[PDB]
């Protein structure tokens, strides 16, 4: 890649991101006053743990579907062997969803858009993983403080996925090249827009991985205590990526 070509990569990635979001950011912002009542929050909190897990896994699976669509749009992805496509998605799809979550998060009142209204972390109390949920909301709060542009969150999420260090890659040097192109595009864009200061403020590496690990650990406990629920009422895509 040359200068015009680096800038074309920036543009391609941004368009891929915008085209594969669940909801438009303007529609999320316009709904910020629409907040779950105390009664509605209590309804969620009182739901059985298995049912709330099932419901949340359904929404998580839908979000993952959009991340797969995003991945399919990135240069080089569709040309990797299926092993490597799946390696990258297993290692990174949940990470991408956790980064995308900041679009739905309102830092002013620490709420997220879930099932048509905004609610706080206490909405999810029935899941029995409150430490994890708290850590996820704090991660969104950290990302909100960065005030990502569309370009910046598009490129940063591409880099979450296109990571040549993932164990199990059969074409590691190809993924290295893809990752480098993306890094150079990202850093070029930050240089041009006087936004290089965000690089020092991005979450440490390890942070996303730790949230993703916590999920898998919690899922292990759930699935052990409720194996028929998982078999019968969790989505196949979820089970393929996490169980």
């Amino acid at each position: 890649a040359s200068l015009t070509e680096i800038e074309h990569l920036v543009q391609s990635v941004c368009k891929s991101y915008r085209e594969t979001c669940q909801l438009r950011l303007e529609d999320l912002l316009r709904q910020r006053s629409n907040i779950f009542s105390r009664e509605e929050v209590t309804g969620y909190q009182r739901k059985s743990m298995w049912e709330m897990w099932e419901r949340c896994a359904h929404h998580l699976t839908e979000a993952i579907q959009y991340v797969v669509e995003f991945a399919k749009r990135l240069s080089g992805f569709m040309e990797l062997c299926q092993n490597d496509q799946i390696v990258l998605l297993k290692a990174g799809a949940m990470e991408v969803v956790l980064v995308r979550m900041c679009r739905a998060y309102n830092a002013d009142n620490r709420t997220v858009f879930f099932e048509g209204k905004y609610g706080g972390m206490e909405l999810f109390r029935a899941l029995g993983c409150s430490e994890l949920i708290s850590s996820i909301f704090d991660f969104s709060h950290s990302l909100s403080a960065l005030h990502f542009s569309e370009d910046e969150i598009a490129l940063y999420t591409a880099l979450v996925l296109i990571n040549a260090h993932r164990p199990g890659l059969q074409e590691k040097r190809k993924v290295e090249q893809l990752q480098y192109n993306l890094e150079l595009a990202f850093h070029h864009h930050l240089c041009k827009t006087h936004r290089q200061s965000i690089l020092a403020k991005l979450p440490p590496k390890g942070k996303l991985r730790s949230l993703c690990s916590q999920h898998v650990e919690r899922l292990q406990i759930f699935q052990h205590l409720h194996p028929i629920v998982v078999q019968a009422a969790f989505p196949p895509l979820y089970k393929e990526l996490f169980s």
């Binding site: 579907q65 797969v68 399919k72 299926q82 496509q85 799946i86 998605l89 196949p236 895509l237 393929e240 990526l241």
Partner: peptide, 8 residues
Amino acid sequence: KILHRLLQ
């Protein structure tokens, strides 16, 4: 696999 299917 669902994931294989979604990939094409």
